[PDB]
Design a protein around this ligand. Structure first.
Ligand SMILES: CCC1(CC)C(=O)NC(=O)N(C)C1=O
Lengths: 300, 237
């Protein structure tokens, strides 16, 4: 179980760690988060009390280094950093732990929610979507735009999700125009899975990461990507059985975790109605359809 | 964006553009079967592709054999329309290719966009105008070539005859849409108006009668009367 210490908390802030959150007051003696489960990526995120604008945060994996948070009064945000001196870090964490100045990652033993939301998410893939090669962790915020959004403006600060566009030469084989547009199986299976992602695990990892950035930061382009990757599978007549079964589980846990009050902005009515009721896969997402109908029947 | 009353003169500027109407591509007669069920029988159709500035009409005749063995024909017909329009564009010299294609029905937007991906600079546009191009098969010479076709065929016409020698494109289009609206609202009466006087004939190389300028004014007024009437006869007014 790993620890992400905090130098201090000089400004009042709501701090999230994965699906949990807690409020820290200005200059409250807070020195970090302990007992973080090893084996998963994690995200530590922030919303300042004085400016609820810009939620921001950091994706990381404690197996990759020793990370800590410190407030920068010049740039005005809590920054993640890496401590290379393993002894200075161990000693700092032990000191903070002895003084009981850390919150404990509050996981219920029965609870598989975080695993189910990050099953296919890998730090190495996060670091290719979010390019900042000098750090082992990845910053994301509410305002960052995606490569596809930019095409339609700073590249170094973009979300390099895989571009999906249903009315594009990549998606449409010359001479199979109607076929490829109405059944996207060739674009899903040959172009995207065999060609770009290599396997379904990487596809699901990017889909899961997009959802999490949409939910935790309200990142609009991430929501667009999440829905595009869902629509591409649902609009394919030929999808491996194991992928449909896994997608149903993935989306079930995403819909389960979504704040009930954010459904209006984070769920695209057209995609979900098409996917659950019109598409080739309208009958292949039993768990997702049941939770959606019981939790958000208005959208449908 | 969409083409409407506000940007109507754009049709007659010098940027090449084509209207595409697909309402006569897939045509059927509905009938009873021996068992008393209902079936359809297709008849030849056509794509109506029209340059509104010059009057040039590319009438692609859709022979019933294209539907043989196919399912979901009303959906296929939109994609076949877009396939044939794309093929026509590719067949034209670059300097004759359109800069915009205006579809008369919004359901043609996605099929035509996908078929024209190779032409990113050709704008595909809908329209808010309710144009009467479905009535094209009430022009006797157009209907005749469609019904006689035994194989796919493209036939070129000038839908304005020689009118542009005397009138502008704006006026010619208005006359065309008036004639077609009349034919669509009451075909029998419209055709009576156009042929009542046997001394006014249709040249072999024309579609409409050889009216003098004064006779066109009379004709056009008779068509307006017809449309307003039917509008009464319809709504009782
Ligand atoms: C030794 C103090 C300090 C400040 C930079 C450090 O050097 N290394 C760390 O890992 N943390 C959390 C710290 O607070």
């Amino acid at each position: 179980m790993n620890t992400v210490p905090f130098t201090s908390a000089p400004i009042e802030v709501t701090i999230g760690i994965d699906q949990y959150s807690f409020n820290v007051k200005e200059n409250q003696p807070f020195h970090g988060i302990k007992d973080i489960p090893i084996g998963h990526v994690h995200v530590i995120h922030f919303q300042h009390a004085d400016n609820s604008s810009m939620r921001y945060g950091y994706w990381f994996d404690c197996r990759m280094g020793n990370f800590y948070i410190q407030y920068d009064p010049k740039d005005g945000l809590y920054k993640m950093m890496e401590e290379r001196d393993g002894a200075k870090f161990e000693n700092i964490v032990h000191n903070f732990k002895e003084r009981q100045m850390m919150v404990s990652y509050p996981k219920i033993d029965e609870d598989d929610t975080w695993y189910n939301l990050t099953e296919f998410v890998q730090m190495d893939k996060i670091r290719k979507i979010v390019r900042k090669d000098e750090n082992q962790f990845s910053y994301v915020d509410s305002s960052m735009t995606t490569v596809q959004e930019n095409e339609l403006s700073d590249p170094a600060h973009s979300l390099n999700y895989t571009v999906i566009n249903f009315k594009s030469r990549e998606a449409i084989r010359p001479g199979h125009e109607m076929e490829d547009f109405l059944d996207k199986s060739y674009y899903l299976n040959t172009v995207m899975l065999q060609g770009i992602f290599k396997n379904s695990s990487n596809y699901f990892g990017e889909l899961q990461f997009a959802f999490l950035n949409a939910m935790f930061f309200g990142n609009y382009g991430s929501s667009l990507q999440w829905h595009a990757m869902i629509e591409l599978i649902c609009s394919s007549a030929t999808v491996p059985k194991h992928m449909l079964d896994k997608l149903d589980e993935i989306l079930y846990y995403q819909i389960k975790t979504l704040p009930e009050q954010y459904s209006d902005i984070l769920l695209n009515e057209r995609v979900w109605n098409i996917c659950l009721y019109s598409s080739f896969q309208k009958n292949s997402l039993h768990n997702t359809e049941k939770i959606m109908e019981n939790k958000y029947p208005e959208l449908l | 964006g969409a083409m409407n009353s506000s940007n109507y003169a754009e049709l007659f500027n010098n940027d090449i553009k084509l209207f595409v109407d697909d309402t006569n591509v897939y045509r059927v007669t509905v009938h009873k079967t021996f068992e008393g069920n209902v079936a359809t029988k297709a008849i030849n159709g056509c794509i109506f592709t029209l340059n509104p500035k010059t009057g040039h009409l590319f009438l692609k005749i859709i022979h019933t054999s294209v539907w043989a063995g196919q399912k979901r024909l009303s959906q296929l017909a939109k994609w076949k329309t877009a396939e044939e329009v794309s093929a026509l564009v590719r067949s034209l010299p670059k300097e004759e290719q359109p800069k915009q294609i205006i579809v008369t029905r919004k359901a043609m937007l996605d099929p035509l966009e996908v078929h024209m991906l190779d032409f990113p600079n050709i704008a595909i546009r809908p329209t808010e105008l309710r144009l009467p191009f479905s009535a094209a098969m009430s022009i006797d010479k157009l209907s005749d070539v469609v019904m006689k076709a035994t194989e796919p065929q493209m036939v070129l016409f000038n839908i304005y005859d020689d009118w542009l020698d005397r009138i502008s494109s704006y006026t010619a289009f208005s006359r065309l849409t008036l004639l077609l609206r009349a034919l669509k609202t009451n075909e029998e009466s419209a055709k009576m108006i156009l042929l009542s006087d046997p001394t006014i004939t249709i040249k072999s190389y024309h579609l409409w009668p050889s009216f003098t300028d004064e006779q066109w004014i009379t004709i056009e007024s008779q068509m307006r009367d017809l449309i307003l009437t039917e509008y009464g006869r319809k709504y009782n007014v």
